[PDB]
Write a structure and sequence with these properties.
The chain is α/β, with parallel strands linked by helices and about 400 residues long. It is built from 15 helices and 14 strands. It is about 40% helix and about 15% strand. The strands form 3 sheets. Strands 2-1-5-14-11-6-7-10-9-8 form a 10-stranded mixed beta sheet, with helices on both faces. It is globular and about 60 Å long. The chain binds potassium ion (2 copies) and zinc ion. GO terms for molecular function: histone deacetylase activity; hydrolase activity; metal ion binding. Keywords: Hydrolase, Metal-binding, Zinc.
Length: about 400
Amino acid sequence: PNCLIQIPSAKDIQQMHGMPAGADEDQFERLKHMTQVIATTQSKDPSLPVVTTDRVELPEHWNQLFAAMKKGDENVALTLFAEFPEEDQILQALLAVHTSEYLQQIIRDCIQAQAKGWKQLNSDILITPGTFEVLIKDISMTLFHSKKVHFSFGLPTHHAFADEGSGFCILNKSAVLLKHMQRNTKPLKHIIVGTDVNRDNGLCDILMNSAADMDICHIDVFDSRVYPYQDEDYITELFNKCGKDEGQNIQSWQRGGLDYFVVNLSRTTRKPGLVHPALVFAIEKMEEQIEQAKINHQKVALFLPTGWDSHEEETAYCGKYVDGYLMGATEARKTRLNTTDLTYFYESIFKLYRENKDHIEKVYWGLEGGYDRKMYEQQIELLMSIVLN
Ligand SMILES: [K+]
Ligand SMILES: [K+]
Ligand SMILES: [Zn+2]
């Protein structure tokens, strides 16, 4: 076939010691164990096309910068970085989303972290000397070494803002990509399905204040009683506009070309034996938004900043710590997603592909949350039984 499973390389993961994740693992131990499970279903089936971030090949000024960062001087790295050519593709696609000054701060931060080997800035972000480089490799590897349909395991993105990171997210790779795709191609129909139990609030901010010119449909499934603890009255406040009831306690907002759908896991609950209506929506909306793109002779681009911390078998506080308790068995059914939902979700999407493979530009699946080792080492295989076929 034609997919690609990007993973961070071993030298890369070895710079993520100490970076916060949602449980007892740090992002090192997490991504170590996940690439292990992919090394499992890759010796089960050497067709699973896994590539590390090391087959990425960067321009000499970038590698020069990383090398200069190691020599410990902030001023030389910055003047060096400042002297990058403004038409370098990487730089061009970063500045489409982030500020230069945030970038420089990540460079200052990486060098300052050289003192004790890490820099804790806010209890949700930890920076290491390697951290800038490993993210550049992660993003570049996806931007140019992409190819249609692409699974990237790597740091989280959706809580990262234009001039700052939060909730484990340093850089918003999902937005850098999307901006990059509309860069010089005919106007696309951008469709986003962010299944992380937490809210795609950084992404949405970035999309809302810079991409109000493109056709985006951001379907955001999240539980408002967990981080970032923002509800429909909040989102009514951002968009300066009351939400439009799309049925089933689901509300859409519009900021120009952006149309943001809050499928609230707590307002929108599973009817008894059924599949969770959240995914059910995503598939219906999607299928609709594709036909709309065929009608307007326009192409589509799909993005899945998905986390598994919305699976019913997560244990992490950002998934199960709601309203003062941990969700019991029963409540886990009606508000969290199960393997049958996911096997329905992904099986659906992949099925939609071959009916409109022409009318696709590229699809991208980006790991976000997911923290219980048992739960993710299994959903990973579930994805790999499905990416296989
Ligand atoms: K979080
Ligand atoms: K979400
Ligand atoms: Zn999450």
